[PDB]
Amino acid sequence: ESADLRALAKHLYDSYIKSFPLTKAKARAILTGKTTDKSPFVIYDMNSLMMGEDKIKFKEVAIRIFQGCQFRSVEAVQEITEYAKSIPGFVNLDLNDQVTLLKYGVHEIIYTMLASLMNKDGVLISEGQGFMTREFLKSLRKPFGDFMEPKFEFAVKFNALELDDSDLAIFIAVIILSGDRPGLLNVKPIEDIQDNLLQALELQLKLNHPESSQLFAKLLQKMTDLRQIVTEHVQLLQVIKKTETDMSLHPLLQEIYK
Numbered sequence: 001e002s003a004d005l006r007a008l009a010k011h012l013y014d015s016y017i018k019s020f021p022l023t024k025a026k027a028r029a030i031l032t033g034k035t036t037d038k039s040p041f042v043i044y045d046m047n048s049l050m051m052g053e054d055k056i057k058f059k060e061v062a063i064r065i066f067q068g069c070q071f072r073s074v075e076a077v078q079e080i081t082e083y084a085k086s087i088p089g090f091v092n093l094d095l096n097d098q099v100t101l102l103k104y105g106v107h108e109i110i111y112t113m114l115a116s117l118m119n120k121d122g123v124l125i126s127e128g129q130g131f132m133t134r135e136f137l138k139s140l141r142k143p144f145g146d147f148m149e150p151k152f153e154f155a156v157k158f159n160a161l162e163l164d165d166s167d168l169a170i171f172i173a174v175i176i177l178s179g180d181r182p183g184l185l186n187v188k189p190i191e192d193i194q195d196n197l198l199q200a201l202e203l204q205l206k207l208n209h210p211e212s213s214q215l216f217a218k219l220l221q222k223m224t225d226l227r228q229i230v231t232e233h234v235q236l237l238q239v240i241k242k243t244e245t246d247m248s249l250h251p252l253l254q255e256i257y258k
Ligand SMILES: CN(CCOc1ccc(C[C@@H]2SC(=O)NC2=O)cc1)c1ccccn1
Pocket: 065, 066, 068, 069, 070, 072, 073, 107, 110, 114, 123, 124, 125, 126, 132, 253
């Protein structure tokens, strides 16, 4: 019954709000000019970068920026982990599979929600207090200058779908519930959950976006864009492990990366 699916949608939305302090609706109001939120400080060069610390509370610069993304992904992983536990049935699955769904789901989710913080020209940072331009990121030196560009490219295409947070909450849950992750022990109870999430997503997109033809199909097709984003990024991490042997990846992050 649709009623059961609407209640699942409400539930997931509610946990989403509770686990992610910076929603897309807040990101959007910061990026456009609404009076509900306050304007960010903009970092577009190395000198405004240094003024960013005397205003916002935040070793060559490209490295230090990179340590900033590191720290933020660790935080996102913590938030995603908190959100996963709220998805009905997730905590009743085998503990090894729970680790496995998170291990592979977490980055596809990060890049999905990172799109919420992006327009074609840059990305919100520091809980929306800052805005780091796309071009300042693309001008970083040799290995670092091109770690964000693919994420911007995805976000521009993904943001065209015009999903709002109640859409994303269900979509994020579908991602984490992927029974095709390598090494899963009991694929079948995972798929039963994902099939219920997919029904909830489908209904949600139909009621929330009644005029957007086949949005459901186009949203799932976006799942291959995420997969390729993850693969390019880990090959880029393997370059930096060797060219800066003096730099430390956060242990939560290197465990996710196998
Ligand atoms: C560009 N931003 C926003 C965060 O944007 C992100 C970019 C990449 C990732 C994936 C990380 S990157 C890494 O080192 N390993 C991962 O899993 C996660 C977030 C900055 C920049 C400076 C300070 C704070 N925020």
